[PDB]
């Protein structure tokens, strides 16, 4: 319906705003675009489903997220991929793991403060009716 399309449009606006705020944070530059395969040639082999913030924006625009829960699954994926691909105690690995956890924590904190629970519940109920 018109009510439901308006709901999902608002969801997309909200998700773009959150994602933009993550993307402009200097700490999260490494997560803004897909990896350069010349920098990490084995990434395609090691990481089952790559994810990055530009891909998240594309998915928002393709109407791939019908709830904030679905969106957070991809944010979680960005983080979990980083913990998986960079496991070692070397400072480089520790830096990116810290940034990955910070990205995840920042997204969840923004959502905690700014997402109305009744809006999310409406999204979830529309999604489950399809
Ligand atoms: C197995 O590879 C890792 C070996 N240890 C050092 C790691 O690099 C640490 C950098 C990563 C980039 C930074 F900004 F976060 C600062 C710490 C290695 N891991 C990775 N190395 C390089 C990249 C990368 C990919 N494309 C473009 C650029 C400029 C850099 C990445 C990217 C991702 C997403 C990742 O998880 N690990 C990387």
Superfamily of domain 1-130: Bromodomain-like (1.20.920.10)
* Among 56, 76, 64, 66, CA closest to 16: 56
Query: Ligand 1 center to residue 43 CA distance, Å?
Result: 10
Q: What is the resolution of this structure in A?
A: 1.8
Non-local CB neighbours of 96 within 8 Å, separated by 6+ positions:
30, 82, 86
Query: Ligand 1 center to residue 92 CA distance, Å?
Result: 7
Whether 78 contacts 51, CB under 8 Å: yes
Query: Ligand 1 center to residue 118 CA distance, Å?
Result: 39
Ligand 1 pocket, residue 35 CB under 6 Å: yes
Looking at the chain, the number of H-run helices and the number of E-run strands are 6, 0
* Among 100, 59, 57, CA closest to 78: 100
Query: What are the two backbone dihedrals, phi and then psi, of residue 4, each rounded to the nearest 5 degrees?
Result: -75, -40
Name the closest-CA residue to atom 25, ligand 1: 35
Buried/exposed code over 38-48 (b: 16+ C-beta within 10 A; e: otherwise): eeeeeeeeebe
Residue ranges per structural domain of the chain: 1-130
3-state class of 64 per DSSP? coil
Whether 92 contacts 98, CB under 8 Å: no
Experimental method: X-ray
- Alpha-carbon distances of 97 from 53, 89, 92, 121, 128, rounded to whole Å: 16, 10, 9, 32, 35
Whether 103 contacts 11, CB under 8 Å: no
The Cα–Cα gap between 130 and 127 comes to 6
């Amino acid at each position: 319906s018109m009510q439901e399309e308006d709901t999902f449009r608002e969801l997309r606006i909200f998700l773009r705003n959150v994602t933009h705020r993550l993307a402009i944070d200097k700490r999260f530059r490494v997560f803004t675009k897909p990896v350069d395969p010349d920098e990490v040639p084995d990434y395609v082999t090691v990481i089952k489903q790559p994810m990055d913030l530009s891909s998240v924006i594309s998915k928002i625009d393709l109407h791939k997220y019908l709830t904030v829960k679905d969106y957070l699954r991809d944010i979680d994926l960005i983080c979990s991929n980083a913990l998986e691909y960079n496991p070692d105690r070397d400072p480089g690995d520790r830096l990116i793991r810290h940034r990955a956890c910070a990205l995840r924590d920042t997204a969840y904190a923004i959502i905690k403060e700014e997402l109305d629970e009744d809006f999310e519940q409406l999204c979830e109920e529309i999604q489950e009716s399809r």
